[PDB]
Amino acid sequence: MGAYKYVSELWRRKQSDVMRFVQRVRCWEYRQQPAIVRLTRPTRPDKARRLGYKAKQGYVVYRVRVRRGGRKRPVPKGIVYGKPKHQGITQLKFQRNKRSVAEERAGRKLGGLRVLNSYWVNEDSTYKYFEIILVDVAHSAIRNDPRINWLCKPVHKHRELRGLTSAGKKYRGLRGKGHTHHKARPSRRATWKR
């Protein structure tokens, strides 16, 4: 279909044509703006329009800024204390992805709202940038819309945190189905190790 295809086609090509110029220029902004930024426009309406975007009250879009690299593990210079299969500080990298951390940060600050989904809005050389959709549960317009009232249900509070986001399903291995998928579905704690 429509106009939404072109910007989607652009954003493939982060490095090329108009998109490397315009988004490297918006990083002059992105470095300046905080690790909470609420904005009133999605940067990608295409991938808003395909992760759940309707303009309608209770909807916010927000940019989150997350550091690049792994994780560094306490205590350095009072170090463990244990045998070296378990010594690791920068060597280990989190097995949550940088996208999920952004989901957590966002849902903590906007505590009355619940993360729907999220997307990628670039990286420079130490920050990785995401824009995240959080959707009010508590207001009538979300409730009287049957495309987005499934979020309202009390079971769905703090869903980013319990890994029920799309990002949270993907790092949990739930992308496949079949062969393989056998240690991920229904849960990484699932059999209790019986």
Partner: protein, 105 residues
């Protein structure tokens, strides 16, 4: 150390002759590589940088003492054999020649 001719006559093991013919002697090493082996189990199993059981490369090691260390390669068929245990060191070869007898000079 040893005179061993590089060029000898011997029986074949192999099933295309299964009789006696001329054979060529050579000392052998290569190693592998392209990685499917122990080398892989190590690459993966590093696992905190641990070479671990990739060392039995040491003790500081040393006692010296072998067996014959050969492959004798046919110069008339390409089928050709390695030999069984008895006790050498060290080993000389070159193209032989000879421990020549006899000397007046």
């Amino acid at each position: 150390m040893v005179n061993v001719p590089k060029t000898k006559k011997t029986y074949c093991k192999n099933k295309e002759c299964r009789k006696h013919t001329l054979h060529k002697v050579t000392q052998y090493k290569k190693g592998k590589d392209s990685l499917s082996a122990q080398g892989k189990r190590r690459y993966d199993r590093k696992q905190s940088g641990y070479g671990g059981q990739t060392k039995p490369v040491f003790h500081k090691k040393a006692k010296t003492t072998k067996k014959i260390v050969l492959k004798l390669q046919c110069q008339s068929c390409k089928h050709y054999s390695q030999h069984p245990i008895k006790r050498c060191k060290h080993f000389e070869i070159g193209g032989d020649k000879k421990g020549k007898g006899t000397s007046l000079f």
